[PDB]
Amino acid sequence: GAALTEKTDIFESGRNGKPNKDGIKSYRIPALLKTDKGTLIAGADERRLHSSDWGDIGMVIRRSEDNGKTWGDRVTITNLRDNPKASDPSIGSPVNIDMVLVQDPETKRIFSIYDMFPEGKGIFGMSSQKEEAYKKIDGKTYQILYREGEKGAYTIRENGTVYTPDGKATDYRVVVDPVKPAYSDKGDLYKGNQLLGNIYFTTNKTSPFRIAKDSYLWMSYSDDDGKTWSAPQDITPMVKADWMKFLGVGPGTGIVLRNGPHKGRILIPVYTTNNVSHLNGSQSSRIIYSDDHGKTWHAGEAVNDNRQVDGQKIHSSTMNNRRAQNTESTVVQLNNGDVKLFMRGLTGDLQVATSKDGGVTWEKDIKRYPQVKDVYVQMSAIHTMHEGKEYIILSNAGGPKRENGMVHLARVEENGELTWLKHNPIQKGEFAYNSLQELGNGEYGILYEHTEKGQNAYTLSFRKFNWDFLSKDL
Numbered sequence: 001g002a003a004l005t006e007k008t009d010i011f012e013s014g015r016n017g018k019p020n021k022d023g024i025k026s027y028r029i030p031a032l033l034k035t036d037k038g039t040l041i042a043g044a045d046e047r048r049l050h051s052s053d054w055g056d057i058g059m060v061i062r063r064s065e066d067n068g069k070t071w072g073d074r075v076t077i078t079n080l081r082d083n084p085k086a087s088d089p090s091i092g093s094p095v096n097i098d099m100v101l102v103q104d105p106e107t108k109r110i111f112s113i114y115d116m117f118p119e120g121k122g123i124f125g126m127s128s129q130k131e132e133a134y135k136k137i138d139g140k141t142y143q144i145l146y147r148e149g150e151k152g153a154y155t156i157r158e159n160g161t162v163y164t165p166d167g168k169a170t171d172y173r174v175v176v177d178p179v180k181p182a183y184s185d186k187g188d189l190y191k192g193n194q195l196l197g198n199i200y201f202t203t204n205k206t207s208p209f210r211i212a213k214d215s216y217l218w219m220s221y222s223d224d225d226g227k228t229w230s231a232p233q234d235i236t237p238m239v240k241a242d243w244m245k246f247l248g249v250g251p252g253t254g255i256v257l258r259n260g261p262h263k264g265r266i267l268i269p270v271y272t273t274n275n276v277s278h279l280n281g282s283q284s285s286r287i288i289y290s291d292d293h294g295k296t297w298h299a300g301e302a303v304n305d306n307r308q309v310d311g312q313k314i315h316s317s318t319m320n321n322r323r324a325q326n327t328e329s330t331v332v333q334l335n336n337g338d339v340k341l342f343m344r345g346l347t348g349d350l351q352v353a354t355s356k357d358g359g360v361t362w363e364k365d366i367k368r369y370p371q372v373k374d375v376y377v378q379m380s381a382i383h384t385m386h387e388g389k390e391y392i393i394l395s396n397a398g399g400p401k402r403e404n405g406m407v408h409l410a411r412v413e414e415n416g417e418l419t420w421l422k423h424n425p426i427q428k429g430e431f432a433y434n435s436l437q438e439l440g441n442g443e444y445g446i447l448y449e450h451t452e453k454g455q456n457a458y459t460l461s462f463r464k465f466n467w468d469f470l471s472k473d474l
């Protein structure tokens with residue numbers, strides 16, 4: 001008997017453009033993680049001012065200890081404070097946006113990796129010119145601070161003390177070890193004991209310093225099953241190349257390889273843009289990984305690196321080809337050791353890349369599956385076993401637009417090839433980003449974006465379904 005539970009709203013948006021009960025207009029970008037303890041962690045972007053990809057956005061989660069039946073109160077991981085002097089509040093806050101959750105099965109540490117931008121319009125407000133964000137000194141890497149009127153780079157060193165371009169300590173200090181709830185004090189700039197401003201503010205500044213205007217990657221972790229989180233760690237310098245303009249995560253839930261030469265490796269989907277074509281023709285998927293339980297991260301190569309496009313080779317750092325782009329993605333490892341990267345794209349159908357070396361490089365054959373439509377929106381996919389057989393469950397909008405949620409089932413053969421077996425609707429009406437997780441006992445859960453009755457984009461809801469829903473027809 002087919003079984004699909006009624007939708008349960010986890011993060012409720014307001015309606016008709018009004019704020020919700022907590023004064024928040026929108027929630028977006030779901031992430032669902034089933035931890036070792038059986039806990040379900042639902043993550044999301046808490047977009048207070050509007051539904052756009054910038055503004056005042058906090059990284060939040062809710063925990064369920066009864067497999068999705070009930071949920072605890074919201075837990076904020078990170079939420080930077082707004083620039084109280086910005087002329088336009090809608091774009092007047094440093095930004096955190098798009099999160100990826102994953103747990104190390106050995107250490108049990110839970111990671112939340114997400115984007116960070118200083119005050120502005122996020123990916124839509126990036127400068128045409130690069131600004132160095134870090135400087136190496138005496139074998140040490142320090143984040144840079146810029147002061148109007150001076151060309152030299154100041155640096156943030158031990159204890160947050162600001163040093164002049166010439167290497168002399170100043171009386172300015174940055175809060176590099178935040179202590180306020182949500183770490184809303186991170187980046188605060190002090191002169192002596194007086195708070196002057198914040199290094200993440202870019203307009204109407206009250207302090208002399210700001211970090212480089214660029215795209216960053218931050219990470220927070222929890223060792224207590226999601227109840228409390230560490231202060232944000234800037235992992236950007238570990239993975240961002242000097243040519244990269246944007247570098248952000250493909251939101252959802254990452255994975256840890258289960259088998260092969262790279263078992264234990266944590267994979268985080270991400271994508272970049274270059275300075276040649278940025279968002280018009282350079283969005284390129286890839287993953288970043290960690291082989292030491294999240295201590296250090298490394299960038300793999302882009303699916304587009306040395307890819308053959310129309311008898312011509314391209315590279316993610318120099319490409320300018322709209323149709324060859326691949327953006328947000330979801331990653332899965334097969335029992336044969338191969339890694340599959342399902343990438344959001346502009347071909348109208350499902351695009352999948354394959355890596356034979358734990359996600360570092362990608363094979364030449366980018367497969368397209370007409371069986372699974374892609375309206376250019378995020379998707380999620382997970383590996384699963386059923387009666388000794390290997391499968392992959394993938395969910396995304398069925399179209400025409402971002403609507404009619406579908407859960408696709410594919411059989412995985414020993415060569416890693418896919419055969420799509422079923423396509424079952426799961427949510428009528430508006431449907432966008434989603435995140436799947438296997439719950440066990442033949443059941444699965446999904447946290448997704450949907451709206452109805454005038455709700456603001458989006459309300460994130462949860463549903464559970466079993467194998468009877470996947471295989472049998474409704």
Ligand SMILES: CC(=O)N[C@H]1[C@H]([C@H](O)[C@H](O)CO)O[C@@](O)(C(=O)O)C[C@@H]1O
Nearest residue numbers: 029053097098115122123248279327328
């Ligand atoms: C960092 C960031 O802006 N992420 C956003 C991305 C990018 O804007 C696009 O991938 C750029 O092509 O996509 C969304 O806007 C979208 O399509 O709903 C949602 C997501 O939060």
